[PDB]
Swiss-Prot record:
Cofactor: pyridoxal 5'-phosphate
Keywords: Biotin biosynthesis, Pyridoxal phosphate, Transferase
Keyword Transferase recorded: yes
Family the entry assigns: Belongs to the class-II pyridoxal-phosphate-dependent aminotransferase family. BioF subfamily.
Gene responsible for this protein: bioF
GO terms of biological process kind: biotin biosynthetic process
Chain residues that bind pyridoxal 5'-phosphate: 107-108, 178, 206, 232
Role noted for this protein: Catalyzes the decarboxylative condensation of pimeloyl-[acyl-carrier protein] and L-alanine to produce 8-amino-7-oxononanoate (AON), [acyl-carrier protein], and carbon dioxide. Can also use pimeloyl-CoA instead of pimeloyl-ACP as substrate, but it is believed that pimeloyl-ACP rather than pimeloyl-CoA is the physiological substrate of BioF.
Residues bearing PTM N6-(pyridoxal phosphate)lysine: 235
Protein name listed in UniProt: 8-amino-7-oxononanoate synthase
Stated regulation of activity: Competitively inhibited by D-alanine, 8-amino-7-hydroxy-8-phosphonononanoic acid and 2-amino-3-hydroxy-2-methylnonadioic acid.
PROSITE patterns: AA_TRANSFER_CLASS_2
EC number annotated for this UniProt entry: 2.3.1.47
Pathway the protein takes part in: Cofactor biosynthesis; biotin biosynthesis
Length: 383
């Protein structure tokens, strides 16, 4: 029965594979986390540039409602394409170097809509094994053939692409991995997929706004222009939503065939105005300053960890895993940091490889130097 299927799946769960209850917060974005009525330094949010609370983006969100109401009233293919959506699309395309941008309500939605429109059962997706769920789940729920390659292993990927395919091949990877905060070798990857007549799709959720000139992506940084670029706005941009960057013909294909783009409700115009304001800050001199601040904080953290009984991952991202090793030690370490006012969360097998239990830390441009020092001190006294 259905209820037996559900009860049986919930009952079978081992203690290490069960997800904890969601914890309600009063504030979850940026420097401070507020849970109950207690203030914690927040080392768990994705607000990498501190823009969720920026006065200019708040104003834009607010005025946009005055000007346009809230809901768009519908889909882009009827009366839900606002002049504000068109201007944001144009601005993103100009910023990143693509002929076209198409807006989506989330990264999950963008990824699924591209893959649903472009891949048939005959085709193959070659996906990095550590791709985040937004991408992988999309590639899974497709009728195409999904094949994973070892993390960032371009030799493995070439092997994959060389295998006979009855259709076309799409390579998918992230610019900065949600997991370890490490970068993909995009240029090398772009080379072997061209060599096997494939197209390349990069999701740059964790790099967009945060690295490269004017905060352009992981792709800019590495001088690579994949056929498809997906950017999402729930992290560094401090808002919500996503866009697909692409060519004139690919955008025309998606606008004719991608049902997810054609029939979904477009985002509130006021949300798009907040995103245009976020983009402006990201491109501005203040954008450079926030990125430079974030990099200084990462430097301060990594330098302090040298003198600690922990290891670091290969990351220059705001994402800075602290490898602890032992599961009990890591959980007790996170609990203790929380007790001392530092909000962190621990991750253990099997989400991570054996013996690589760790803290999931993130830093943001809203943090201050003394915050990093407070983290280091608690880590020393409990490490």
């Amino acid at each position: 029965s259905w209820q037996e299927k559900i009860n049986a799946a919930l009952d079978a769960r081992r203690a290490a594979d069960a997800l904890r209850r969601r914890y309600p917060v009063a504030q979850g974005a940026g420097r401070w986390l507020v849970a109950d009525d207690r203030q914690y330094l927040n080392f768990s949010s994705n607000d990498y540039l501190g823009l969720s609370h920026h006065p200019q983006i708040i104003r834009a969100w607010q005025q946009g409602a005055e000007q346009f109401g809230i809901g768009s009233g519908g889909s882009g293919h009827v009366s839900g394409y606002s002049v504000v959506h068109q201007a944001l699309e144009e601005e993103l395309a100009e910023w990143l170097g693509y002929s076209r941008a198409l807006l989506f309500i989330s990264g999950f939605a963008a990824n699924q809509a591209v893959i649903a429109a472009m891949m048939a059962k005959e085709d193959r997706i070659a996906a990095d094994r550590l791709s985040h769920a937004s991408l992988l789940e999309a590639a899974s729920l497709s009728p195409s053939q999904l094949r994973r390659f070892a993390h960032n292993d371009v030799t493995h990927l070439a092997r994959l692409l060389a295998s006979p395919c009855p259709g076309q091949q799409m390579v998918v990877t992230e610019g900065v991995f949600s997991m370890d905060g490490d970068s993909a070798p995009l240029a090398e990857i772009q080379q072997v997929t061209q060599q096997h007549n494939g197209w390349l799709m990069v999701d740059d959720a964790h790099g967009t706004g945060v690295i490269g000139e004017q905060g352009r992506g992981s792709c800019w940084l590495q001088k690579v222009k994949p056929e498809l670029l997906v950017v999402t706005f729930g992290k560094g941009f401090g808002v919500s939503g996503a866009a697909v960057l692409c060519s004139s013909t690919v955008a025309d294909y998606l606008l004719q065939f991608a049902r997810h783009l054609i029939y979904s409700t477009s985002m509130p115009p006021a949300q798009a105005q907040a995103l245009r304001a976020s983009l402006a800050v990201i491109r501005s001199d203040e954008g450079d300053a926030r990125r430079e601040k974030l990099a200084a904080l990462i430097t301060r953290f990594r330098a302090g960890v040298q003198d600690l009984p922990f290891t670091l991952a290969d990351s220059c991202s705001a994402i800075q895993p602290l490898i602890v090793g032992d599961n009990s030690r890591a959980l007790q370490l996170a609990e203790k940091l929380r007790q001392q006012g530092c909000w962190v969360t621990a991750i253990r097998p099997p989400t991570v490889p054996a013996g690589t239990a760790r803290l999931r830390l993130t830093l943001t441009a809203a943090h201050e130097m003394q915050d990093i020092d407070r983290l280091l001190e608690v880590l020393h006294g409990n490490g």
